[model samples]
Target: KFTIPESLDRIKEEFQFLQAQYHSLKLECEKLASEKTEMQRHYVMYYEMSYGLNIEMHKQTEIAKRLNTICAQVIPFLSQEHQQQVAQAVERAKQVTMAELNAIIGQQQLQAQHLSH
Candidate 1:
């Protein structure tokens, strides 16, 4: 029959491996708690800004949508000429409700690569 066991040196090697694993797990847990708290704060700010309006109005508002359409010019449903006019106009006012709504959170986030320029 084959013997089933490790020598003293082999047992110590396994213990070292297990110790490393334990340390790594603790590090990961600690890191997540701090980062998650910051992330939650960002979302909370946005929600507060849009609190009363149902999803649609708070989401982007009509001005942003018109800008999108005016820029794209590919939407077949809308007349292409009308889209051009909307694009050319310096400002098409957003509906009163949408304009009233403001950024719930102070804006700060990475645009392209990192937040810092």
Candidate 2:
């Protein structure tokens, strides 16, 4: 017959408590690692969006220049109906660019909010 001593029982209880603590710490570490990975993904997305926005801004500037040239060169030669059509095209381009800018800003805001969490 094998007998378990009282001190050995106390040691077993302590070991069980330590094991629980170790598991708790491991879970916390895993949670932090997952959070870190998500943050890195978001950071990459932020950088890509910023780069895309820069390219779009440059293209918008080019479009603005083209619009200016078209207005200056065609206004005097165009008939009234043609002039109105040109005006409409320019207005629509401007409106579309503005909308794109707003969308990018909104996306950036949403990303920022996600990071805050």
Model 2 stretches astray by more than 4 angstroms: 1-4, 73-93, 96-117
lDDT of each: 0.67, 0.90
lDDT of 1 by residue, 3-81 (tens): 4455767888999999999999999998999899988999898788677566667566676877776656554555878
TM-scores for every candidate against the unseen true structure: 0.39, 0.51
Best by lDDT: 2
107: Cα error in model 2, Å: 22
Write candidate 2's Cα lDDT for 1-117 as tens digits: 556687789899999999999999999999999999999999999999999999999998998898788786987799988888888887775565767989998999999999997
